[PDB]
Symmetry: D2
Subunit: 225 residues, 4 copies
């Protein structure tokens, strides 16, 4: 079995143009966003970065968020969870090839509780791999064949993925997938991205707050989204 890991692997380096009479108390993506917004009116003379970013989002000028981007390397995510994930446009993805073969399985969050459920699951995964080898043997009598014999692998099979999005795309991913209407695995992932995103871009994600349900899981909601 494999646990969810979300690692932040890239963010924006910001290099302020020396000839613009403007400065700010921020660096990186948060600084770039303010610069871009101010560029629209050449308003170089909401006087803190935080307050400027707060204002931008109140006034609904969200396109300025698109200039700054963040990438994560995500492991311990199920095939079915990634299928939901890649439905989002305005992200770029690089995913582990289906042709690749180590059985690593991701336990659904509702089942992580239980030894019997967990055992039923890994057993089923072992049975699938056994079938995979049987299908491959008879089939090859070659590289595409390998991919095609993975017809038998379960939804819970682990995959790994590099995801990159601008701040605007991340905020929409979190608004959609960290709600009660989303399944628990992608919601779990969405809350973990938000956590890491707030560490690098607090001002950008300040409007999201996390509510821990009685049900046990966490949800994220914003008045702007």
């Amino acid at each position: 079995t494999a646990p969810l890991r979300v690692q932040l692997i890239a963010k924006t380096d910001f290099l302020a143009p020396p000839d613009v009479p403007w400065t700010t108390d921020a660096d990186g993506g948060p600084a770039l966003v303010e610069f871009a917004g101010r560029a629209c009116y050449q308003s170089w003379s909401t006087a803190t970065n935080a307050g400027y970013l707060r204002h931008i989002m109140d006034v609904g000028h969200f396109s300025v968020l698109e200039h700054a981007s963040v990438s994560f390397y995500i492991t311990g995510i199920s095939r079915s969870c990634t299928h939901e994930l890649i439905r989002h446009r305005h992200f770029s993805y690089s995913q582990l090839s289906q042709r690749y073969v180590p059985s690593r399985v991701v336990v659904p969050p509702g089942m992580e509780d239980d030894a019997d459920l967990r055992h039923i699951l890994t057993e089923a995964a072992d049975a699938a791999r056994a079938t995979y080898s049987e299908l491959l043997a008879k089939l090859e009598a070659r590289k595409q064949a390998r991919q095609a014999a993975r017809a038998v692998m379960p939804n819970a099979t682990e995959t790994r993925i590099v995801v990159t999005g601008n701040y605007r795309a991340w905020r929409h991913f979190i608004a959609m997938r960290a709600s009660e209407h989303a399944d628990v695995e992608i919601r779990r992932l969405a809350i973990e991205c938000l956590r890491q995103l707030a560490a690098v871009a607090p001002a950008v994600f300040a409007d999201f707050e996390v509510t821990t349900l009685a049900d046990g899981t966490e949800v994220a909601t914003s008045p702007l989204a």
Copy 2:
């Protein structure tokens, strides 16, 4: 228990020429709209080497004006496609999709193309699917003793049939075919691409007839365009 691939064309363009523009052409529908949009850039309504619709469309493409193709679109309803093939399919930007919900439970499996002529493999596959389903019901019962179903769904194989409405403009279809109807493409997605092509060539020959379909010695078809 096994579901064959079926691709059904469900939508295309209804073109309505504006009366106030001094132009007609030997075409209707999507191909007529594409010519209209191309002509709009220069107001070349009165049109002599590109004065037919098919000639005009070929020229647009020869000269690399592919954005004019974006105005016309086609939708398919696709059944008998594996969950795993659809995962490859939805990596394509510039399409719109509506997919059979994860939370749907009929067991129906799609046979990988290279396993279709093999009775032994067909049987190993369908028995596998029966075992996964048995396991689904065992997990689900024990889990209850929406979320429970989402959790039990963890054991369902990649070969499980899904169903999808896919909508794309001609430019998007042309790129999908180029990419997915080649040698290097996975067999299930390649078969889908050649089926889509066949039907697209039927409704809009001037846009899609530049694709040459050839059979490989292995039995599968490939499409290539100059």
Copy 3:
């Protein structure tokens, strides 16, 4: 001078699949949209009375925020009597396809000036002078590839110069354009364009565009909001 004209030139042609056990009291885009939404759950029999009409189903789709299903249907307009600066603001919207009157090829009067003959005459005279300048530059610049001259000479043409455009989008993209551009915060020319598109869209797809209400302001200009 050139007045605004918006002509609907293309819309979706829907072909229901005969092998699917479903009909609806609509056709074209609204029918395609309903089919796509229903395909997600295979809800072909229409068990719910509230959504057993096309309008009812579409209303529910949007209440429930399933806006991605609107992406399947599209509408194209041909737009004339639109200034260069207004089209610049239009083409900022992504998820649209455009074909615009070429740069290698009449003024539109600002709506707040339309009733004032003195103001209109100041503008047309300025446009006349600019056009004189363009001719003087064009001649001096020429003194095939000698279309480099026209590219350079256009430097003097004003914002108010008319352009022409074919715009295609799906219903989801149109709804967003209207919501952003039909509000008071947008300048009057793009707002006027958004309201006219809304009118024509609500005529073809009422259930999809009904929630937009058009109100009039104190200057005799219109706004729309959902």
Copy 4:
């Protein structure tokens, strides 16, 4: 009137933070290192046959896995670009833009961008700046008249904005604008392919050649396949076999 030269400033690029737990290192940082990491993550190919970042990137290009290039991005602040050239630029999707507001009118004098084909001719340049001055004069005449005509209408703040919006109807194509443009490597490669060619008009061709210069510096392997050649007219073009 005053004339603005083209200035393209790189204001942002990718910062790459290697995950400590992955058994891999490379001889690069930033965007190029991220692209390699993402390409290797597809196959978990952390260890090498053995005996460079630039070699891996060429491999990625040569196998046509261009989607891996989408992970790294660069942003430029561009000034001294005409409103017409920016109209052409923003047609490109897969970029994000923030542009000087259509409203903005420079307080001190008109700023215009001379078409490159006119750069070497004092008479042509004078006709253009004279035209630009006459448009500004018309602008101020229209604005004052509009503000007068709107004197009794409600919301005087709104009326000022609307007066400005209508009056700018006369401003020419050559008017200077400024823009922040952000794209991933894949989007930049296509912008260069399309706009650094013979077909492209000279003002946008100039811009694309300059973006290329600065892109080639930050990521040489990603942009190496483009070759710049000068035409008989003294103008540069970039082509790639890819």
